[PDB]
Structure formats: C-alpha cells, structure tokens
Amino acid sequence: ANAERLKRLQKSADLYKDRLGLEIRKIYGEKLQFIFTNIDPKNPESPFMFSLHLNEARDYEVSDSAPHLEGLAEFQENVRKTNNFSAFLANVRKAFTATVYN
Amino acid sequence: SEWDVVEWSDDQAVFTFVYDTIQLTITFEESVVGFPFLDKRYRKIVDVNFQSLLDEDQAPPSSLLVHKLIFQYVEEKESWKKTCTTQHQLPKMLEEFSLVVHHCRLLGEEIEYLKRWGPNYNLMNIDINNNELRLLFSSSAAFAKFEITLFLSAYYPSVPLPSTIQNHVGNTSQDDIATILSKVPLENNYLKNVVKQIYQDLFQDCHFYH
Amino acid sequence: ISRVKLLDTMVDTFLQKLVAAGSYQRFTDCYKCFYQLQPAMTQQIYDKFIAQLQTSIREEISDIKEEGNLEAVLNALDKIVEEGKVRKEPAWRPSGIPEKDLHSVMAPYFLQQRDTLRRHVQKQEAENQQLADAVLAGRRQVEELQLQVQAQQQAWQALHREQRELVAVLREPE
Amino acid sequence: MSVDPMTYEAQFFGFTPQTCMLRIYIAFQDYLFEVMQAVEQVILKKLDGIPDCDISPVQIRKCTEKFLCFMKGHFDNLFSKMEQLFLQLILRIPSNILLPEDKCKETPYSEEDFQHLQKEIEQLQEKYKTELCTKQALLAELEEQKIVQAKLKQTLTFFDELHNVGRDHGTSDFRESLVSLVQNSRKLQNIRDNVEKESKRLKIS
Amino acid sequence: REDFRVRCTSKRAVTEMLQLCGRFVQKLGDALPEEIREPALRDAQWTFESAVQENISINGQAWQEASDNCFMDSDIKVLEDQFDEIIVDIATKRKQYPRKILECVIKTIKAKQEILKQYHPVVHPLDLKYDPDPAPHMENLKCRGETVAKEISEAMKSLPALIEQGEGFSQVLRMQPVIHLQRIHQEVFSCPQRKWYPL
Amino acid sequence: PIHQGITELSRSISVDLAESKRLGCLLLSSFQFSIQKLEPFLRDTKGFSLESFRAKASSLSEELKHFADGLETDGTLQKCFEDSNGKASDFSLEASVAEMKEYITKFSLERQTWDQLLLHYQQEAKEILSRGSTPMTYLGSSQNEVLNTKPDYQKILQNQSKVFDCMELVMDELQGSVKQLQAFMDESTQCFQKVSVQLGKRSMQQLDPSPARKLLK
Amino acid sequence: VTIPSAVYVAQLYHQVSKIEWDYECEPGMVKGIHHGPSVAQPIHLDSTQLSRKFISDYLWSLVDTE
C-alpha cells in the first residue's frame, strides 16, 4: 500500500500548503526550504521563503530568508541545547505571519 | 510512615522527614568502626542536628505552621541531646518524632482542606499567628458570628485544646463550644470533626429563616 | 307726689293733735290762775309758744333730712321701690348665714373663670387629638419601614437557598 | 322697743330709726322744757321790778310743771302712734322690694351646688395639668419619631445605594444571576464527570 | 366725788314725812288773814316740798323724769348704746366688706390664672440620646460587597468559557479513538502538596 | 328737772353734816325763804310792827330744827353705808332683755366667726401670692390609650444593628461561596490542562525523536 | 528513498502544525484536532464554503500568541 501512503502524504502537504499556507521541501546539498503562501490579504500567491542547511556540527542555521530575518542565534542555541525544533518552526511561522503588518 | 533513610555512613547518618524538608542528621563519633565492632553503648551520638531545607520565604502558611510546630516540639524537648545519646534508642526517638510529624502534617492538610472548603462548613477565615489557629464561623443560618482561637500545640490531637471563644455577634456561651468539644473525641482528624459539629448543631439543625 | 309732702303733712296733723290738747281750757286755766300781769302782752306770749313749738318740728325735720342726707337716700329709696315693684312674691333677705351671703355675690366671676378654664381645656383637647392622630400615623409608618427592611433582609437571605444548592453541587471528596 | 332685728332698714338708711325717734323725743322734750322756763322768766321779768305781785313765782313754776306733765301725758301717747307709723310705713323697707346690693346678688344659689362646682373646678384643673403633661410627652415622642424616621430614611438610602452599585457593574438581579450560575455549575459538573470518566477509562487501556 | 345730791330709795314715805312736817308752815300759814290765806299758804307749802325734792337725786336721774325703782335705767341705756353699736357695725359690714372681698377674690382669680398659664412650659428628661450610626462599618460593607459583586459578575462570564471548552474537549475525546482507529491516519502518525512545599 | 329762783341749793350742799342734818338745814333754809317771801305783803302801821311775827317764826324754826334732830335717830353707825332693795318677782320686759341678750351672744359669736373667715380668706390669698413666685403626667388624660400602647423604640434601634449584622453574615457568606467557586474553576482548568498533557504526550510518543537527523541522511 | 523521505516529512508536518486532520469525511468540510498549549481543540469547518484566507486566519489566530 505504498501508493496510497505516498498519495495521502502528498495530499497532506498540499492541504498544509492551501488550508494552512506552509509547504516544506528537501533540496540537494543537505538543504531544506519552507515556502509560505496565502498570507497577504490582497496577493494570496505571494511566496515567503526560508531555506535552512546544516553546519559541520549538526546545528540549525537558516541558509537564506526572503525577506531576511533577525532572530536566528537564539533559536540556534535553543535547538543546540534543548534539542527542540517545534518552537523554532512555530516561531518562524509567527514571524513570517507578522511580516505583512510590520 | 512518612520518613526516608538516605545513608548510614561511618561518619554520619541521614533521615529525611516531611517531603525531605527536615534533614535529621546524626553526626556520630568520629571512628572507622560502628556499634557491631564497638560496644553496644560505645556508639555515642555527637550531634542530632535538624537541618531545615524548607525555604520559609516561599513557604505557604501550612508549611510554616507545621515546621514551627515541629521545631517548637524540638526545642521544648531538646533533651534528646540529654536522653538520646545512643544508636540503640535512635529508632524509638525517631518513631516518637515521626508521630508528632505525622500529626502535624495531617493538621496542615486540615487547614488546607478547611481553607478550600470553609463556606460549606461555614469557616470563612483561618488566621495563623505563630502557633495559634483562628477559625471564623460566621453565617446567618442562625445569626451567628464568632472566632474560635485554638492554641494548637505539638501534643495535638492527644490533648484537648484551650478554646477561647471571642464572641462577635450572637449568643454563644462557653458551655456550647464545651459540649461541642466533648462530643468530638480527642483523636485523629479532630479539627475537621469539630468544624463539622459546629456547622451541624448551630447552622444545619436550625431552620433556614425565610 | 314726693315723700316730703306727706312727711311734713302728717306731722303737722300731729301738731294740731298736740295743740288741741288742753287748748282753750288750758288757756282759761292759766290766765285765770295768773290772770294779771299785763293782759295784752301775756295774751301775746302764749301764742308765741305755740308758733315756736309748731315750727321747731319743721326745722328739726329739715335738719334731719339735710345734714343727715336723708332727702337723697329717700329719693333713692323711691327709685328702688319704683324699679322693683314688679315682684310681689316674698323677696329673700340677708339671713345672717355668712356662707350663702358670700356665695350669692362671689358666684358670677368664679363662674366666668370656670368657663374660661373649660375653653382652655377644650382647646387642649382639640390639639391633643391631632397630636394623637399624627403619632398613630407615625406608628404605622415606622412599622411599615420595619416591614420593608425585614423584607429586604429576607430577600438577601433568600440567596442562602442557592448557596446551599451550590454547596450540595460542589461535592466534598469522600 | 321693737321685737325685730332691724337688720334691713338700718342697712340702707345707715342707722336704726329707733335712734331717730329717741333723738327726736329727747330734743323735743328739751325744747318744751326750755320754752317753759323762757316764758316764765319773761313773766318774771316784770315781777322783779313790780313788788307785791299777786301770784308768787313759785306758783308759776308749779303750774308750769303741771303744764309740762299734761303735755307729756298726751305727747308720749301720740308719739307711740307716730313711731308705729314711721317704723313700719314711712321709713321702713318692705319685703316686696330689693335693695341695690340685694339686686347685685338677687338669685339664690345653693351651697351644695357650690361645693359640687368647686370640686368640679379643681378636678378640671388637675385634668388640665395632666393634659398639658400629656401634650409635652406627645411632643417629645414626636421629636424622637422624627429622629428615628431620619435614621430609617438614611438606612433606606443605604439600601438604594447598594442596589444601584450592584447593578452598576452588570449583575442586574442577584437571585437570577446566582441561579444561572448554579445551573452552569451543574452543567460544568456534568462535563467534568464525563471528562473524568473518559480519562479514567483511557488511563487504563 | 362730784355728786353731792341726796339719794332716796322711798318716795311715798318721804312725801308723807314732808306733809307731816309741813304742819309747822301750816301754823305759820295760819298767821295770815283768812281772806288771803289760801294763796300764800299754797305758795309756802309747795315751795317747801319742792325745795326738799330739788336737792335729792334719784340714782343720778332728774326728779321730774324719775320712775319706778325696780331696775336702773342707766344700765338699760348703756346696753342699748351697745346694741345700736353692734347693729350699725353689722350694717357697715354688709355695706362695704362684701365689696372688698369681691375686689380681693377677683385679684386672686387673676393670680390663679397667671399661675396656671405660667405652668404651660414644662420640660422633663425623656429624650433618649444615642451614638451616631457607624460610618466606617457601612463603608466596609460597601467596599467588600462591591468587590464581591465585581468578582461575581466576572465569574458569570468566565465560567461559560470553561463550559464551551469542556464541550469541545468532550468532542475531542469522541474523535480521538476513531482517528487512532484509522489505518492511514496512524500511518501518518507513526501530590499537589509537592508543589506547595519548596523542595 | 325744773329749778329756778334764788336757788342756793342742789349743788350747794355742805359736807360736814349727815344727810338727815342736810335735809334738816334744807328745811330750815326753805323756812327762811318762806319768811322772806311772805313778809313783803305786810305793811307797817301805827301800833303794829313785825318783831312778834319774826320772833314767833324764829321760835318755830328752832322747833323745826329740834324736830329734825330728834328725827335723825337710827341704829348705831347705821348711816355709814346706804340701803338698797327691790322686787323682781315677774315681768315680761325682763324676758325681752334676756332674749335679746342671747341675741348679743349670737352676734358676739358672729363677730369671731366673721373675723376667722376673713382672716382665713386673706391669709389664703397671701399664701397663694407668695407661692406663685416661689405617674400623673401620663394618666388622667383622655388619651391614655396612645400612651399605654407604646412599643419599645430602643428595641427597634437595636434590631437595626441585628439587621446590619445579618447582612454582614449573608454577604461574607456569599464572598466565601464565590471564592470556593473560583477555587473549583481553577481545579477544573487544571484538570483540563493536565489531561491535555498526557494526550499530547501520547501523540508525541510515536513521533520521531530526532527526525532531522534522519532527514539529513 | 521515497518512503523514508515521505514518512519523515509527515512527522515534520505533524510536529509543525501540531494538527491532525480527517480525510474520510467529504473534502467540502474539514475535521481535525489541534494540540495547542491550552486544552486540545477540535476543528470543524467547511473548506469549500469559506475563503482560504479567512480559515487560515481562524486556525493560525487560535494559536496562543501571548
């Protein structure tokens, strides 16, 4: 039943993308991308990007952010010490959501 | 049994009482041998010290009252240093200390339970001053309002308590509370029983005025 | 018409009654026993006595009524008689009983005093009636205010039923 | 001499008429006397200068005593009738007439009625006194009634202020609010029993 | 003593003795002519007894007005003067003193009514003074009643949030097993006192 | 009391002679008066003179005075006092005098009675005048009913305090009850939170502990 | 390669959204569950009846931001 599993997993990612607004994608070079959609009240397609990669010491560091962000060091320390990433992804979601209204 | 044993070292032994807050440390005589190798009376106790790990700054009134009561029982009877100088009498002095500890812990639970559920039993205030207890019974079920000042002591509840009823509103004589105390036996759970008895006789039996 | 006429008249009749006694026989007796000093002059002396004694009554009565002030009191008596002649039944007279004599004159003013006193007491009664009515109304008013305050404290106490049901709902751990 | 008190006629004339009669009689007999000696002395006036008078002066004195007594014999008898007329007819005050002060008193008032009226007036005096005392007590009661009415109005104003303050926040009706609170608490009991039993059955398996 | 005159208790005996002794004048009167004897004789005899009588006094009364000796008339006169005195006294009594006591009693009535109306102001201690009502007491009632009402109105709105949360959580409990009872769904899926005592 | 003439009588009475001697010399003097009033009628003529007449008159006067002296006889020293008698067996004017004497008694009693009455009245007036310048309050009136139907107002003013105390009781009871309500709402919220805790923990249990480590390789 | 990547991105998605969904119901409506910091909550709405923006604001505003 691999086909059904993969099809609903793609459907789950798609419903996050449309219903929730977030889609994740692993790309080459040990990098991952978070794509944010349906935030701006006027322009719903407006992409918001941030790609994160891994250093030589297994740490979270956002490789790039479109638009850029500021709060990276504290979340890096948080995931390095308390090995938690739920709060990090939730907080970057909160920041990107707040990005529309300054 | 609310007592825990931590260690029996060649230098000292440690008991933890009431949520480990009271550290009864037995500092023995400094030797590399114990009572088995030595004589049964040679194992003298240098210091029966009572470390207080309870932080009174953030402690609630129940903890302050229970710890003050235990320490008052200690200081009024510190003659352990005169009477408990051997490891043979150590278990029995521990047991008799645990008895007052258990009574005082149950008492603290009683003040907590009453502070939570007073208006059900008409107990709208518990004010603790040093080692006293002020139970404020006040209701218009029989047009009554009075404070009972139970001078709680470490001997509670194996001794009757001096009950000085300072009347506020209504006609209550010393005989009324005296009969209340007599009908409530001097045993465990005494405070809750006396509160319930006051509620029953003076406020539930009397018909609600309409 | 006046009293003085009759008073002076019947006494003159008395005078004639007096002088008629002896009279001519008296004159004959005295003027035959003596009968001679000087007949004309002795004749004259006898009548002088009669005239002087028959006038001395008149001057005496005049003095009695004048210096005794009896003419004025006689006129007053006539006025009283003409005023009170209407009543013919036996009129009461001062009987010498001091108490009734006092009462007959002290009754009227004491009577008016008693009248004025009852006027005062009736005014007091009139005012006291309204005072009692006001106090009776105030009694009802205060009992009524007691009624609202008792009803209000009963209403606040009526909450006790809901507290009891709330206590029953909040079950103690058993 | 009269068998009577004369308490009335002298009461108005100021003197008993018997005194007037006795004065009249004494004065008149004195005058009769004096004129007897006057006339006999006038006769003697010619006897002093005329000797061998046919009639001795003492004979004139004798006949003069005779004349005096003979006038007296009828004079007293007629004066009796004069008195009987004066004291009863021409100076007396009849019983059918009322004197000025008698007119002042006039009507007879019974002394027993006076005693009853006096006890009545004194009793009405003490009644007036107790009525005025009752007036004073009633007025004091009125003052204290005003005071207690003011206090009652003050506490009723307190009641109104308490109700207004309680309604100010939004708890318009205490009884209804507490009843609805009890009902909501009962529903909360229902859901909390549900959650407790569900947790208990889930905590095991 | 001013009375020198002679006092006699008998009159008939004295007159008879005078008549008997007058026989001396009779004999001397017989020493006159019979033609003129009678006038001169009567002269002498009347002068005799007249002079005798004029020297005597009948208990101080005049001879011509003398009367029977049964009772003294001076005593009767003194009594009669007293009787007139008392009668005129009672006459002046009924004249003036009733009016005077009338003038007295009217003044007494004025005094009585003055005393009566002066008694109208009467004050007796009957008022019951009491301490003023306790302002701080009713103020404390006001304050804690106000805070109770505040918190009660707050609870009335806070509790329904607990109600709706409980209903939602009951729905969550309802949905939980079926969601965990589903195949691909799990495929995707795969003492308070201790707090009180600071340890 | 007719008396005239040469007189020399009445008031002119000697005091050295007894009343019998007094009347005797009165007789004697009257005798000379008779002699001198009888003498002028006689006239002197030849062989006729008055010596015999005057001598016989003088002898008669001597006989008269001797007769009076003989008549003055009486009991020894009996003239030192006087005599007084009278008969009062019965009369009617005496009865009138007696009865009018009881009238005197009646008026004498009336005098003192009137004096006592006027004195009592005037002294009562003076006493009232002096006194003017120098229980019953509730009864005896027509409105004793409003007085004796009086409730105790102090009891009402005291029951005011009882009402206030009852409100204190009731409202502090309400305070305690609603505090208990808060203490139960907090406990219910704690129950909700803690049950959410283990349900979330059980959901997390099958989640990858370190999914990113498996993600990198 | 496909299976592990898919299961891992599924776990990452569940960790991120903290939300499980319902698929057996019709796609015209959305049923699900959210594991928020407060009491766990249901999710019952109509996906095809409201605009995506409003529903997204509804879910992402229920997350406790205070």
Author numbering:
A (entry chain 5): 123 to 224
B (entry chain K): 2133 to 2342
C (entry chain B): 32 to 205
D (entry chain A): 1 to 205
E (entry chain N): 33 to 222, 264 to 272
F (entry chain D): 112 to 245, 256 to 338
G (entry chain 4): 131 to 196
Paper text:
One of the outer layer main components is a ten-subunit assembly comprising Knl1C, Mis12C and Ndc80C (KMN) subcomplexes. The KMN is highly elongated and docks on kinetochores and microtubules through interfaces at its opposite extremes.
The RWDC of KNL1 docks against the lateral surface of the stalk, approximately 5 nm from the upper end, engaging the DSN1 and PMF1 subunits. In the KMN structure, the two Mis12C heads are closely packed against each other.
